[PDB]
Curated annotation (Swiss-Prot):
<feature type="modified residue" description="Phosphotyrosine">
    <location>
        <position position="34"/>
    </location>
</feature>
<comment type="similarity">
    <text>Belongs to the protein kinase superfamily. Tyr protein kinase family. JAK subfamily.</text>
</comment>
<protein>
    <recommendedName>
        <fullName>Tyrosine-protein kinase JAK2</fullName>
    </recommendedName>
</protein>
<comment type="function">
    <text>Non-receptor tyrosine kinase involved in various processes such as cell growth, development, differentiation or histone modifications. Mediates essential signaling events in both innate and adaptive immunity. In the cytoplasm, plays a pivotal role in signal transduction via its association with type I receptors such as growth hormone (GHR), prolactin (PRLR), leptin (LEPR), erythropoietin (EPOR), thrombopoietin receptor (MPL/TPOR); or type II receptors including IFN-alpha, IFN-beta, IFN-gamma and multiple interleukins.</text>
</comment>
<comment type="subunit">
    <text>Interacts with EPOR, LYN, SIRPA, SH2B1 and TEC. Interacts with IL23R. Interacts with SKB1. Interacts with STAM2. Interacts with IFNGR2 (via intracellular domain). Interacts with LEPR (Isoform B). Interacts with HSP90AB1; promotes functional activation in a heat shock-dependent manner. Interacts with STRA6. Interacts with RHEX; this interaction occurs in a erythropoietin (EPO)-dependent manner. Interacts with ASB2; the interaction targets JAK2 for Notch-induced proteasomal degradation. Interacts with MPL/TPOR.</text>
</comment>
<feature type="domain" description="Protein kinase 1">
    <location>
        <begin position="9"/>
        <end position="272"/>
    </location>
</feature>
<feature type="site" description="Breakpoint for translocation to form PCM1-JAK2 fusion protein">
    <location>
        <begin position="174"/>
        <end position="175"/>
    </location>
</feature>
Amino acid sequence: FHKIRNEDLIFNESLGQGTFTKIFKGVRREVGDYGQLHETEVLLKVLDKAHRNYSESFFEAASMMSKLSHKHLVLNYGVCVCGDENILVQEFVKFGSLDTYLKKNKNCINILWKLEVAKQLAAAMHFLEENTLIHGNVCAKNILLIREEDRKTGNPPFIKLSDPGISITVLPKDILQERIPWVPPECIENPKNLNLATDKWSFGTTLWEICSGGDKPLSALDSQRKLQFYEDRHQLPAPKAAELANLINNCMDYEPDHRPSFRAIIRDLNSL
């Protein structure tokens, strides 16, 4: 990871939180190509100081993302570990994360938009699967909208997958249970069961989000009832716009070995 100096970073408005992190919009002063000086908008993810003991996992999450380069993976600029801070510096995306965008724009997102976005996420996950690299936290809140759809120029939306944050293999069990149904049943039973098949299940959950205008599946269920949802082997209800329901359910297969490859997922999406 490239080391960025505290002095070159300006923190601006808070944008929200992640697990044990706070997230800000910021500006990075830098020397760019040809020696030109730039003030670049950046996303600043700050590990809580009370949770400094997660620093290794916090950065490992991003470092994995930066081992491979791909048009659908978020760009990490570097880290700032000056002083007592643990800061991840990433590209800033004007349109924010997908979960918010779906909620705010649900009255003007149709099936073709959802299919295009599903296809791009499937392509990103296929890239990871071919590199045998586990993401571990696929969800709409970890997808960024680079570009809106522009029908007038035929331009589709364009998304990127961001890093998974601190791994489920080190998080407390109550947080894992609160993350049902993105966390797959086998990882609730044993978080060290994290595997490539994990991301197929979470991909299904994320498709359900995309088809549900940003609703959170099972949000009405407390942690105890989410656990019992897995014990009783329930599936999610079909979204009202049900075009992707069968794919969602096929990805959310309680048997990890039966979940379809991302190449088969892509072939399925292209059939619609």
